C-alpha cells in the first residue's frame, strides 16, 4: 500500500544483479538476505542505504588508500626475461601505476592535476609503445591473448579518459579513483598475460 | 591475529557495515545478526565484496536523490493527516500549526535550487516550527493529568529533529547536497505526525 520498500528493488537488486559476474552465489545469498530482512522490517533497506551514503567521506578516504596501495606489486607480476623490450615493459608499467596511484594527492589542486593528466596520458602512451614493441618477441600466430589484453587496456584507458571529462562537470572525485584503480589492475593484467604466454 | 589475516580490501566491512548493524541491533537483533553473518561469510569467501557493494550503492545515489525528493513532495497530499478530532481552541491550534509545518516542509523541493527564495523559505520554516512549538507547550500544560513519561519524550524528540533540520541547512550551504535536506524534512514531518498521535491518546 506504500512504496517504503522501493529501494530494495530499485537499488539493492540492481546492485546484486550487477555484481553477478564478480560472484554469482554471494549476490544470490545477499539478495535473499535483504529480501527476508525487508519482508520482516519494511523500510529497513532504505535506512541501511541512507547510513551507507552518510559514510561517503570514510569510503572516499578508503578508495584513495586502495589506489595508493595499487602502485606496488613487485614480487608476482614481473617478466623474467632480461630483453630490452620486456624490461622496458616493466618500467613503463611501473611508471604508469605510480602516476595513477598519486592521483588522490594531486586532484584537489587544479594546476598540478592538469600536469598529472598530461603525465598520465604520456605514461599510457609510453606503455602502449612498449606493449607494441614487444609483440614481435612472440610467435606471430600465438598472440591472441596478448592482443585481447591490449584491447581491454585501451577500453579501460578510454573509460578513464571519459571519466575525466565527467569529473570536470561533476566534481565527484571517487569516479576518478575507481577508474584509475581499474586501469592499474588492467596494466597488471597486461603484465600477467604478457609473462604467461612468453 | 585477526587484523593481520584480514585483507585491507575488507576494511569497509568494519568501517561502514558493522556500524550499520550495531545501530540496527538496538532495534532488531535478529535482522542485524542475520545481515551481519551474510556479510561476514560473503566477505570471507570473496574479499573486496563489501567494497564493491558500497561503490555500486554510491553510484546509484541519484535513485536515492529522486526517491527522497519524491516522498517530500508527496507529503502535500497528507498535510491534513492525523488531525485530532477534539473541538477546543488548544487542539484547533495544534492541528492548524502542524498542518502548516507539513505544508511548508513539502514545498522545499520547489524552492531549494533558487537560493534567493530558499533563504526566504528558511525563515518561514523556523517561524512555522516555533509556532508549532509555542502551541505544543500550551496543550502540554493543559492536558497532562496522565502521561508524562511519554509526552516529555516526544516534545524532546521534536526539538531534537527540528534543530537537526536547521543543522542540515548550514551543512547544505557548505555541501550543495539536497538529499540531506529532503531526508531531514521528511523526518520532521514524521515527528510532527508522532506529536499529533501522542496527544490523541
Swiss-Prot record, chain A:
BP GO terms, sorted: angiogenesis; cellular response to leukemia inhibitory factor; endothelium development; establishment of Golgi localization; Golgi reassembly; intracellular signal transduction; intrinsic apoptotic signaling pathway in response to hydrogen peroxide; negative regulation of apoptotic process
Q: Which residues carry this modification: N6-acetyllysine?
A: 165
At what sequence positions does the UniProt record place the cross-link Glycyl lysine isopeptide (Lys-Gly) (interchain with G-Cter in SUMO2)? 172
Q: Which UniProt keywords apply?
A: Acetylation, Angiogenesis, Apoptosis, Cell membrane, Cytoplasm, Golgi apparatus, Isopeptide bond, Membrane, Ubl conjugation
**Chief site of localization:** cytoplasm
| Topological type in the membrane | Peripheral membrane protein
- Effect after changing residue 158 to D: Loss of interaction with CCM2 and PXN
Q: Which GO terms describe its cellular component?
A: cytoplasm; cytosol; extracellular exosome; FAR/SIN/STRIPAK complex; Golgi apparatus; Golgi membrane; plasma membrane
Record carries keyword Membrane: yes
The portions of this protein that span the membrane are none
UniProt keyword Acetylation, yes or no: yes
Molecular functions (GO terms)? protein homodimerization activity; protein kinase binding
Tissue specificity remark: Ubiquitous.
Q: Where in the cell is it found?
A: Cytoplasm; Golgi apparatus membrane; Cell membrane
Quaternary structure annotation from Swiss-Prot or TrEMBL: Homodimer. Interacts (via C-terminus) with CCM2. Interacts (via C-terminus) with PXN. Interacts (via N-terminus) with STK25. Interacts (via N-terminus) with STK26. Interacts (via N-terminus) with STK24. Interacts with GOLGA2. Identified in a complex with KRIT1 and CCM2. Interacts with KDR/VEGFR2. Interaction with KDR/VEGFR2 is enhanced by stimulation with VEGFA. Interacts with RIPOR1 (via C-terminus); this interaction is required for the association of RIPOR1 with either STK24 and STK26 kinases and occurs in a Rho-independent manner.
Family, according to the entry, reads as follows: Belongs to the PDCD10 family.
Function, please?
Promotes cell proliferation. Modulates apoptotic pathways. Increases mitogen-activated protein kinase activity and STK26 activity. Important for cell migration, and for normal structure and assembly of the Golgi complex. Part of the striatin-interacting phosphatase and kinase (STRIPAK) complexes. STRIPAK complexes have critical roles in protein (de)phosphorylation and are regulators of multiple signaling pathways including Hippo, MAPK, nuclear receptor and cytoskeleton remodeling.
Tell me what disease the record lists for it.
Cerebral cavernous malformations 3: A form of cerebral cavernous malformations, a congenital vascular anomaly of the central nervous system that can result in hemorrhagic stroke, seizures, recurrent headaches, and focal neurologic deficits. The lesions are characterized by grossly enlarged blood vessels consisting of a single layer of endothelium and without any intervening neural tissue, ranging in diameter from a few millimeters to several centimeters. CCM3 inheritance is autosomal dominant.
Name the UniProt record assigns to this protein? Programmed cell death protein 10
Which organism does this sequence originate in?
A: Homo sapiens
Swiss-Prot record, chain B:
Q: Taxonomically, which superkingdom?
A: Eukaryota
- Membrane topology for this entry? Peripheral membrane protein
Which GO cellular component term is one of those annotated? FAR/SIN/STRIPAK complex
Provide the protein's localization: Cytoplasm; Golgi apparatus membrane; Cell membrane
Cross-link Glycyl lysine isopeptide (Lys-Gly) (interchain with G-Cter in SUMO2), sequence positions: 177
Tell me what effect the entry lists for residue 126 to D: Loss of interaction with CCM2
Q: Which residues does UniProt assign to the signal peptide?
A: none
Q: What tissue specificity does the UniProt entry give?
A: Ubiquitous.
Name the UniProt record assigns to this protein: Programmed cell death protein 10
Q: What organism does the record attribute this protein to?
A: Homo sapiens (Human)
Amino acid at each position: 500500500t506504500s512504496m517504503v520498500s522501493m529501494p530494495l528493488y530499485a537499488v539493492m537488486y540492481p546492485v546484486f544483479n550487477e555484481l553477478e559476474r564478480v560472484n554469482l552465489s554471494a549476490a544470490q545469498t545477499l539478495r535473499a538476505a535483504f529480501i527476508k530482512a525487508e519482508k520482516e522490517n519494511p523500510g529497513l533497506t532504505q535506512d541501511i542505504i541512507m547510513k551507507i551514503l552518510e559514510k561517503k567521506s570514510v569510503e572516499v578516504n578508503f578508495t584513495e588508500s586502495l589506489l595508493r596501495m595499487a602502485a606496488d606489486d613487485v614480487e608476482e607480476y614481473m617478466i623474467e626475461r632480461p630483453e630490452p623490450e620486456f624490461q622496458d615493459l616493466n618500467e613503463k608499467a611501473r611508471a604508469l601505476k605510480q602516476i595513477l596511484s598519486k592521483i588522490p594527492d594531486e586532484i584537489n589542486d587544479r594546476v598540478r592535476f592538469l600536469q598529472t593528466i598530461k603525465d598520465i596520458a604520456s605514461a599510457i602512451k609510453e606503455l602502449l609503445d612498449t606493449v607494441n614493441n614487444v609483440f614481435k618477441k612472440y610467435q606471430y600466430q600465438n598472440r591472441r591473448a596478448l592482443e585481447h589484453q591490449k584491447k581491454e587496456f585501451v577500453k579501460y584507458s578510454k573509460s578513464f579518459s571519459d571519466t575525466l571529462k565527467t569529473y570536470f562537470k561533476d566534481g565527484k572525485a571517487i569516479n576518478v579513483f575507481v577508474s584509475a584503480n581499474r586501469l592499474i589492475h588492467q596494466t597488471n593484467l597486461i603484465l600477467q598475460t604478457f609473462k604467461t604466454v612468453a
